């Protein structure tokens, strides 16, 4: 006679049964049943200063939209790194070892914002 089709949540079951609704944990439970919040585990919203901002939620109809071109890795490379290498190649001051000079990162370890695996949320 139990309803099998309804979702299993903490409102149901005895007192002992509990579970989260998806809220991210922000602290630790120490011995003796004491909660110790950790400030670093609490997200902090980085909010910019909007003074002098010239952009509003809606855009004018008169303004014409452009052609959609999903950005690709090749396109970014040509814009940023290709010109430096091209000029350097003419000057001859280019070597395989110093690709980092143009911005190459050998490993993501040591970066605050690791590209992969991502260590930063949206």
Partner 1 sequence: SPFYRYGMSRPGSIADKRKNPPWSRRRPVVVEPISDEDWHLFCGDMVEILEGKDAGKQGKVVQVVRQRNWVVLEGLNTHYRYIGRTKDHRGTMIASEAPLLHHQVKLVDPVDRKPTEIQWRFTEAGERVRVSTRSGRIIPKPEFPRADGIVPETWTDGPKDTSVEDALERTYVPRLKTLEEDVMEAMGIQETRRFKKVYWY
Partner 2 sequence: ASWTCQQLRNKSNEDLHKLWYVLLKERNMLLTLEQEAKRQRLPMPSPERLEKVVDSMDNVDKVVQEREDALRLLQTGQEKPRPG
Partner RNA sequence: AACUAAUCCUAGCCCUAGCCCUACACAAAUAUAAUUAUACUAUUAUAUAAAUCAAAACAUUUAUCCACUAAAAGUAUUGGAGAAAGAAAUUCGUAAGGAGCUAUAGAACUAGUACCGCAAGGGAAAGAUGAAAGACUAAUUAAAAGUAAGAACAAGCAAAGAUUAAACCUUGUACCUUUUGCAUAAUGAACUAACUAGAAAACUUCUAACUAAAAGAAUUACAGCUAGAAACCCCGAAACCAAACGAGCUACCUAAAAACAAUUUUAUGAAUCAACUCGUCUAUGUGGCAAAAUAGUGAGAAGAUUUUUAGGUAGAGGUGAAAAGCCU
Partner RNA sequence: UCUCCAGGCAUACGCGUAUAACAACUCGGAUAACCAUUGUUAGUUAAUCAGAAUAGGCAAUAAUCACACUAUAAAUCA
**92 contacts partner 2 (rule: CB under 8 A):** no
Three-class SS state of 76: helix
For Cα atoms 112, 118, 119, give the angle at the middle one, nearest 5 degrees. 50
**Which of partner 1, partner 2, RNA, none does residue 69 bind to, with CB < 5 to 8 Å depending on kind?**
partner 2
Which residues are CB-contacts of 80 (< 8 A; sequence separation ≥ 6)? Answer: 103
**70 contacts partner 1 (rule: CB under 8 A):** no
**43 contacts partner 1 (rule: CB under 8 A):** no
What does the binding site for partner 2 look like in residue numbers (CB under 8 A)? 47-48, 50, 53, 55-61, 63, 65-73, 75-77, 104-105, 108, 115-118
């Amino acid at each position: 006679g139990a309803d099998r089709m309804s979702k299993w949540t903490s409102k149901r079951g005895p007192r002992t049964f509990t579970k989260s609704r998806g809220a991210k944990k922000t602290g630790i439970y120490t011995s003796d049943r004491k909660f110790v919040q950790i400030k670093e585990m609490v997200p902090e919203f980085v909010v910019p200063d909007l003074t002098g901002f010239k952009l509003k939620p809606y855009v004018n109809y008169r303004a014409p939209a452009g052609i959609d071109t999903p950005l690709t890795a090749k396109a970014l490379f040509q814009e940023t790194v290709a010109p430096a290498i091209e000029k350097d190649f003419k000057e001859g001051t280019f070597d395989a070892n110093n690709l980092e000079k143009y911005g190459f990162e050998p490993t993501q370890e040591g970066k605050l914002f690791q590209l992969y695996p991502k260590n930063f949320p949206r």
